[PDB]
Design a protein around this motif. Structure first.
Motif, PDB file in Angstrom:
ATOM      1  N   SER C  40       0.744  -1.186   0.142  1.00  0.00           N
ATOM      2  CA  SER C  40       0.037   0.139   0.031  1.00  0.00           C
ATOM      3  C   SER C  40       0.886   1.234   0.011  1.00  0.00           C
ATOM      4  O   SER C  40       0.531   1.959  -0.803  1.00  0.00           O
ATOM      5  CB  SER C  40      -0.748  -0.048   0.996  1.00  0.00           C
ATOM      6  N   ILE C  41       1.778   1.318   0.848  1.00  0.00           N
ATOM      7  CA  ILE C  41       2.912   2.400   0.951  1.00  0.00           C
ATOM      8  C   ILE C  41       3.507   2.621  -0.537  1.00  0.00           C
ATOM      9  O   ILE C  41       3.398   3.649  -1.209  1.00  0.00           O
ATOM     10  CB  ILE C  41       3.891   2.184   1.913  1.00  0.00           C
ATOM     11  N   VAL C  42       3.913   1.702  -0.917  1.00  0.00           N
ATOM     12  CA  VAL C  42       4.486   1.808  -2.387  1.00  0.00           C
ATOM     13  C   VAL C  42       3.500   1.982  -3.471  1.00  0.00           C
ATOM     14  O   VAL C  42       3.900   2.979  -4.403  1.00  0.00           O
ATOM     15  CB  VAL C  42       5.314   0.196  -2.586  1.00  0.00           C
ATOM     16  N   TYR C  43       2.252   1.527  -3.545  1.00  0.00           N
ATOM     17  CA  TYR C  43       1.396   2.091  -4.292  1.00  0.00           C
ATOM     18  C   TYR C  43       1.095   3.425  -4.389  1.00  0.00           C
ATOM     19  O   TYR C  43       1.069   4.157  -5.256  1.00  0.00           O
ATOM     20  CB  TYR C  43       0.104   1.159  -4.185  1.00  0.00           C
ATOM     21  N   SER C  44       0.800   3.858  -3.289  1.00  0.00           N
ATOM     22  CA  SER C  44       0.472   5.291  -2.836  1.00  0.00           C
ATOM     23  C   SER C  44       1.757   6.140  -3.327  1.00  0.00           C
ATOM     24  O   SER C  44       1.642   7.397  -3.919  1.00  0.00           O
ATOM     25  CB  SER C  44       0.131   5.802  -1.511  1.00  0.00           C
ATOM     26  N   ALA C  45       3.016   5.680  -2.952  1.00  0.00           N
ATOM     27  CA  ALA C  45       4.255   6.652  -3.263  1.00  0.00           C
ATOM     28  C   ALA C  45       4.269   6.673  -4.773  1.00  0.00           C
ATOM     29  O   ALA C  45       4.589   7.861  -5.170  1.00  0.00           O
ATOM     30  CB  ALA C  45       5.289   6.093  -2.742  1.00  0.00           C
ATOM     31  N   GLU C  47       2.057   6.318  -7.459  1.00  0.00           N
ATOM     32  CA  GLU C  47       1.126   6.973  -7.786  1.00  0.00           C
ATOM     33  C   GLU C  47       1.052   8.352  -7.648  1.00  0.00           C
ATOM     34  O   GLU C  47       0.995   9.210  -8.430  1.00  0.00           O
ATOM     35  CB  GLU C  47      -0.418   6.474  -7.537  1.00  0.00           C
ATOM     36  N   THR C  48       1.632   8.795  -6.428  1.00  0.00           N
ATOM     37  CA  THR C  48       1.898  10.350  -6.366  1.00  0.00           C
ATOM     38  C   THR C  48       2.842  10.755  -7.022  1.00  0.00           C
ATOM     39  O   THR C  48       2.925  11.902  -7.716  1.00  0.00           O
ATOM     40  CB  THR C  48       2.122  10.320  -4.710  1.00  0.00           C
ATOM     41  N   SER C  56       4.127   6.950 -16.189  1.00  0.00           N
ATOM     42  CA  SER C  56       3.628   6.014 -15.694  1.00  0.00           C
ATOM     43  C   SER C  56       4.325   5.432 -14.502  1.00  0.00           C
ATOM     44  O   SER C  56       5.721   5.670 -14.500  1.00  0.00           O
ATOM     45  CB  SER C  56       3.204   4.735 -16.586  1.00  0.00           C
ATOM     46  N   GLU C  57       3.945   4.630 -13.612  1.00  0.00           N
ATOM     47  CA  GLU C  57       4.457   4.109 -12.536  1.00  0.00           C
ATOM     48  C   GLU C  57       5.566   3.312 -12.653  1.00  0.00           C
ATOM     49  O   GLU C  57       6.933   3.663 -12.163  1.00  0.00           O
ATOM     50  CB  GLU C  57       3.815   3.438 -11.567  1.00  0.00           C
TER      51      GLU C  57
END
Lengths: 65, 65, 151, 116
Positions: C40-45, C47-48, C56-57
């Motif tokens: 979750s942390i990596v996902y939000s980081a 995407e931000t 793209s990520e």
RNA sequence: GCUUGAGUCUCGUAGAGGGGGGUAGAAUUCCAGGUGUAGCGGUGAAAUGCGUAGAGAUCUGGAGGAAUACCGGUGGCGAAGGCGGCCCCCUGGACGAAGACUGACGCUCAGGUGCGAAAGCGUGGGGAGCAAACAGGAUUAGAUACCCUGGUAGUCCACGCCGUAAACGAUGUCGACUUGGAGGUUGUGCCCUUGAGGCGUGGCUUCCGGAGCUAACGCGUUAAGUCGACCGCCUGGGGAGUACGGCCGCAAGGUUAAAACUCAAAUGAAUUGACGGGGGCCCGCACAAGCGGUGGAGCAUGUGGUUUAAUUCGAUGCAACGCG
């Protein structure tokens, strides 16, 4: 101790160097006089040379196989 | 492993550098009998022949020049 | 590892857009086994940083660590006596590893508000060649490159 | 400057340093470099790499002499004595021959008894 | 008398055998100059040291001293020490071929005499390198050691002196006899140099091994085997190759050489282990790559110490301490 080594060389080709003397005398004369170890080392290595000749004579074995 | 002194009557001389220039190396220094045959007696006689040559400048002590 | 020359272990890809590399990033960031909060942390980081950078990520991660992936590293192969720093060029998987791990320790440090913002701003600095992780890369590169006298 | 044509390149390779010097037919120096001056103070200057760095840094400062082709001539043992040849080649000097004058006493002075 | 021992002679051979005198080249150092520059050197790392007064590097010229690269070889010579560039002079020995000559002229030796590495000593030269002592740097807990930078005697030459060494194949000298194998080196005879040869025999010689001998390791025709002759020497370890005295020496000291006292061992060879900052191969979360902890704080608990009347008793290196 000297080679022309014609420029179509791309090589070291100085097998004359390490084949004739350069290190065989220099790095062992650089120091260490001691006047007596030459004979000691001489007959150690010479026993090993006669031991090589003994190996060449009696080199007939069974390979463990 | 040919000793030219097998058929060479008129034993080793210090003027026949034509024949002596084969018992030295590129550097001007005598070769071992273990690598050039040359029965030890004639190897010693040609050793002093080469030494007398060098004295008469018929052979160089080294290849410095 | 005396006799073993063992290989690799299977790793499942991203539950989002599939990326073994981002899964390994998750597993390098995970603490206490909390894979859910790690991903979750990596996902939000990412995407931000993706809304930030306009890439793209995957490409953001790619050329934001590509500035921290090392080339040569230092080892101590003692021979004929004392121990001195022989620089071994690092294999590609060791590159991936060292890069991600330096970025993650950089994010552990450099505390702003939350780990997500920390890590995101950090690999933005690594994309623009500014962060403590890229400073680690360059300091390893000058810790070597001064011991080339050993090869 | 003086537009010197060709020359010789002495590599005094010791167990500690590797002195590279460039000289000419008449035997006059045009420049030099050494693995101790090129950094590598200490344990690294007795390595083959620092020797080639010295050879590169001595290819420097002789570009002003237009020296075309070099007679590399080495001296003594050491980690250098080959990497300096490689570097004097890769610097763009036409290595015309690779000789040496590494000195051998014909059993002259007694050497120091060092290194117990 | 005799020739089988021992010698002499005629012909040669191999040799770092010896003393005397010349001489050559490489190389280290020094001196003078040329070019050229900030380093050289040294070490595990350094630093003393050398360097901008311009070194180290490279070049030319000059001086001087010691040892002779390769040949180089358990190869040669010598009684032993020991002797190795080349050339000349005086000189000893060895050994082979054949023949002749003398005819026991032999072997071993107390005392005696002579030679006797290196160090060392006296007199006079010489002094490049190396190098006790010495000084500095470094290491180290200290380091009056190893290591580094210097450096005096000395090593070198002539003439004396000392007279010892692991002066050791730790093997006294001479003679005889007793299976073998491969070598090295130096002679010589015979047959086809028939073409780098093959068959004998003399000398010196290195290694393996048989019978035998030995405590064993090992020696093994060059005996430590079987014997013969003469000599030297030993008689438990320490005290002690010391003390006193004698002889020698300039001195250092040498040679001869005890006693009290003390221990019941000291010693050799080989065997099984263990161990090595010995060698080879290998294994373990042993190390390396990595994650998380302990050591910091608060608390639980066990332990040492202290306390108390008692703070029951026991475990108390890993392999005791949230243990009974």
């Amino acid at each position: 101790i000297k080679v022309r080594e014609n420029e179509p060389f791309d090589v070291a080709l100085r097998r004359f160097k390490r084949s004739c003397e350069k290190a065989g005398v220099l790095a062992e004369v650089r120091r260490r006089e001691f006047y007596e170890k030459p004979t000691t080392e001489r007959k150690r290595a010479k026993a090993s040379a006669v031991k090589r000749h003994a190996k060449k004579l009696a080199r007939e074995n069974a390979r463990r196989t | 492993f040919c000793r030219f002194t097998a058929e060479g009557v008129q034993e080793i001389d210090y003027k026949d550098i034509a024949t002596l220039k084969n018992y030295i190396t590129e550097s001007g220094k005598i070769v071992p009998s273990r690598i050039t045959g040359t029965r030890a007696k004639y190897q010693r006689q040609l050793a002093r022949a080469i030494k007398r040559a060098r004295y008469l400048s018929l052979l160089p002590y080294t290849d410095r020049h | 590892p005396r006799r073993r020359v063992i290989g690799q272990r299977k790793i499942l890809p991203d539950p989002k857009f599939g990326s073994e590399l981002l899964a390994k990033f998750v597993n390098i960031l995970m603490v206490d086994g909390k894979k859910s909060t790690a991903e979750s942390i990596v996902y939000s980081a990412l995407e931000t940083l993706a809304q930030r950078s306009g890439k793209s990520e995957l490409e953001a991660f790619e050329v934001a660590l590509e500035n921290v992936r090392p080339t040569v590293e230092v080892k101590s192969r003692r021979v004929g006596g004392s121990t001195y720093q022989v620089p071994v060029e690092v294999r590609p998987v060791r590159r991936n590893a060292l890069a991600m791990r330096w970025i993650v320790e950089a994010a552990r440090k450099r505390g702003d508000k939350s780990m997500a913002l920390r890590l995101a701003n950090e690999l933005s600095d690594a994309a623009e060649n500014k962060g403590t992780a890229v400073k680690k890369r360059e300091d390893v590169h000058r810790m070597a490159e001064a011991n080339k006298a050993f090869a | 400057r003086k537009q010197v044509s060709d020359g010789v390149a002495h590599i005094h390779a010791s167990f500690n340093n590797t002195i590279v010097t460039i000289t000419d037919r008449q035997g006059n120096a045009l420049g030099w470099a050494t693995a101790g001056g090129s950094g590598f103070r200490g344990s690294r200057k007795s390595t083959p790499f620092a020797a080639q760095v010295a050879a590169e840094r001595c290819a420097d400062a002789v570009k002003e002499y237009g020296i075309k082709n070099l007679e590399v001539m080495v001296k003594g043992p050491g980690p250098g004595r080959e990497s300096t040849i490689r570097a004097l080649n890769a610097a763009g000097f036409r290595i015309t021959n690779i000789t040496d004058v590494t000195p051998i006493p014909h059993n002259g002075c007694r050497p120091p008894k060092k290194r117990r």
